[PDB]
Design a binder for this molecule. Structure first.
Ligand SMILES: *[C@H]1C(C#N)=C(O)[C@@H](C)[C@@H]2CCc3c(OC)nc(C)nc3[C@@]12C
Ligand SMILES: *[C@H]1C(C#N)=C(O)[C@@H](C)[C@@H]2CCc3c(OC)nc(C)nc3[C@@]12C
Lengths: 123, 123
């Protein structure tokens, strides 16, 4: 006989700690330098493996590093990184399209679908 | 108004990819060198942030690095790393105690409790 065990919300709890570590800027191996039209420059520290596990684009990119990012608004990038680390994303009704464009850019299909589904309803 | 969205099994899916990356030995930043009485030496590559998010002991340790580990059987370490990356652990009925001792050593309380609860029933 063999004993087997599964903790249901382990992944959720471990992501909570992973998110904590990102805010404390601990164990981070990538710094995203985001520049975009008009908007001020911004830096976001993260863990390559966490981003990679949420975005095929990020996974391709990585398989301390400073990465220059263009063509995406810093606040959009912020919301997508937050999604990677928390499984949740929120945005103002009037910017749903902008977030979708970032999501499409980094192939985060669930966010893409969600924004699309919402925008279809808005007409 | 603000749009908000949550993907339920995102963390589970992202851990699946994180587990994939570990097996492919990609993005890894720690190599655990495990030596124990009689048993042959073993190496385990992992991501510091993933272990850290499952074990307070690992979190303390980290906040490519080779780490020497003693006092724990390699197959026990293997099962705990697998738990960190999959939320699931299995062991032969006759070794539940050994896994518990590793779990206690690395303060993975859910595994500890599970093994304890099972061993209490076994008497
Ligand atoms: C619109 C908005 C609202 N309300 C948000 O929730 C964030 C996510 C948006 C960031 C991107 C953006 C851009 O990018 C070009 N332009 C405008 C006019 N507004 C937004 C935000 C602030
Ligand atoms: C016992 C066992 C079974 N059946 C397992 O499932 C694994 C996890 C054990 C690893 C540790 C261990 C030790 O460690 C000192 N000693 C013995 C005799 N057996 C085990 C395993 C193989």
């Amino acid at each position: 006989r063999t004993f087997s065990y599964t903790l249901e919300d382990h992944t959720k709890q471990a992501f909570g700690i992973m998110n904590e570590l990102r805010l404390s800027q601990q164990l981070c191996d990538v710094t995203l330098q985001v520049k975009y039209q008009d908007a001020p420059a911004a830096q976001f520290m993260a863990h390559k493996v966490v981003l990679a596990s949420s975005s095929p684009v990020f996974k391709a990119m990585f398989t301390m590093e400073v990465v220059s990012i263009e063509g995406i608004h810093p606040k959009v990038m912020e919301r997508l990184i937050e999604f990677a680390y928390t499984a949740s994303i929120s945005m103002g009704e009037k910017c749903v399209l902008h977030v979708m464009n970032g999501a499409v850019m980094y192939q985060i299909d669930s966010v893409v679908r969600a924004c699309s589904d919402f925008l279809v309803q808005q007409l």
